[PDB]
């Protein structure tokens, strides 16, 4: 076969160790998931700079006044979180983040709320978004893309074992830490799903066909999105690429992907099996689960345990000028945070 006797036995033992790890991880997750609040307040922090913006608020670099430690504070305007799924998703995000623990997931430190806003205070990751670095350099070489992809594979193996779907993979949500490893942020679309779920949500370029077609769907949408991410990292642009969302959706559902001439055949083979419309054939969704991905030829040089233990030398280390340095983030319009004298949407956010 492809493996000799010694290589096959080592792989088998490796997969039994994964099972052992995930069983312990599920025990630790459930303890925090069953008993999640109000671990700080706004005036405990100095607000420094906006690091990113969305339709519901912003993420700001903040400095804890007492300790001087820096954090990233996500501020959500409760009155902007108006639509039904916008509300449920915000509760998903907080509850999941307080319960998970993995080396490539951003760590939540505090959460609280006031009359106007919801707040989630996270570890500050000063290396910036993968997105910026990718757009600046153009594309990543296949070994460089593979290093990041392996971290996402392990992170999804972890999340999916807890019945969590992530649902918003893209370079904008992948921060680079001081050692060059990934930290996944923005769990606004993450959800605990034991089988199928039905919300039409995500980012157009990264949506699996079954989402676009209003089909009930499962964790395999994350493996489709991994295919999009790997393609974009290695090409510099995603596989379904058009100016308007409706045009993007048409390309996704077609079942057609073209590859740059510089893609290795191993990479193209992996991507055709991730970007697979037929769910009975999509890698990650078959009887051998995530091992069809981890054992694919394109990952043959990947030491999965060494990636997890962060023993592998990273292809890129961001420059850091010191604590609180924001040089690796883009600039955004600043808007003062106003807290109303009246409580807004108190009942819609009781559990936060």
């Amino acid at each position: 076969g492809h493996m000799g006797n010694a290589a096959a036995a080592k792989k088998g033992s490796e997969q039994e160790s994964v099972k052992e790890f995930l069983a312990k991880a599920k025990e630790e997750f459930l303890k925090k998931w069953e008993s999640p609040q109000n671990t700080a307040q706004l005036d405990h922090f100095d607000r420094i700079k906006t690091l990113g913006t969305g339709s519901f608020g912003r993420v700001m670099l903040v400095k804890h006044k007492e300790t001087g430690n820096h954090y990233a504070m996500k501020i959500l305007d409760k009155q902007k979180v108006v639509k039904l799924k916008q509300i449920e998703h915000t509760l998903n995000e907080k509850r999941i983040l307080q319960a998970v623990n993995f080396p490539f997931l951003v760590k939540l430190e505090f959460s609280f709320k006031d009359n106007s806003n919801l707040y989630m205070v996270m570890e500050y990751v000063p290396g910036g978004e993968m997105f910026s670095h990718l757009r600046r350099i153009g594309r990543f070489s296949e070994p460089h893309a593979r290093f990041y992809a392996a971290q996402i594979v392990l992170t999804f193996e972890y999340l999916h074992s807890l019945d969590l779907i992530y649902r918003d993979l893209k370079p904008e949500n992948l921060l680079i830490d001081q050692q060059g490893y990934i930290q996944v942020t923005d769990f606004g679309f993450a959800k605990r799903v034991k089988g199928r779920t039905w919300t039409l949500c995500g980012t157009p370029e990264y949506l699996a066909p079954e989402i676009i077609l209003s089909k009930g769907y499962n964790k395999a949408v994350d493996w489709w999105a991994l295919g999009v991410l790997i393609y974009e990292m290695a090409a510099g642009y995603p596989p379904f690429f058009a100016d308007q969302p409706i045009q993007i959706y048409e390309k996704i559902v077609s079942g057609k992907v073209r590859f740059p001439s510089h893609f290795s055949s191993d990479l193209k083979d992996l991507l055709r099996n991730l970007l697979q419309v037929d769910l009975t054939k999509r890698f990650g969704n078959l009887k051998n689960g995530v091992n069809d991905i981890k054992n694919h030829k394109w990952f043959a040089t990947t030491d999965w345990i060494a990636i997890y233990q962060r023993k592998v030398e990273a292809p890129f280390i961001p420059k850091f000028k010191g604590p609180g340095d924001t040089s690796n983030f883009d600039d955004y319009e600043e808007e003062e945070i106003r807290v109303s004298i009246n409580e807004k949407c108190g009942k819609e956010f009781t559990e936060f």
Binding site: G54, S55, K83, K85, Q86, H89, F131, R135, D168, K170, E172, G188, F189, T199, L200, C201, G202, T203, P204, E205, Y237, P238, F241, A242, D243, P245, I248
Partner: peptide
């Protein structure tokens, strides 16, 4: 090869 090159917003519904 015309497509979106800036940051892409996620959509919660529709």
């Amino acid at each position: 090869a015309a497509g979106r090159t800036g940051r892409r917003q996620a959509i919660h519904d529709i």
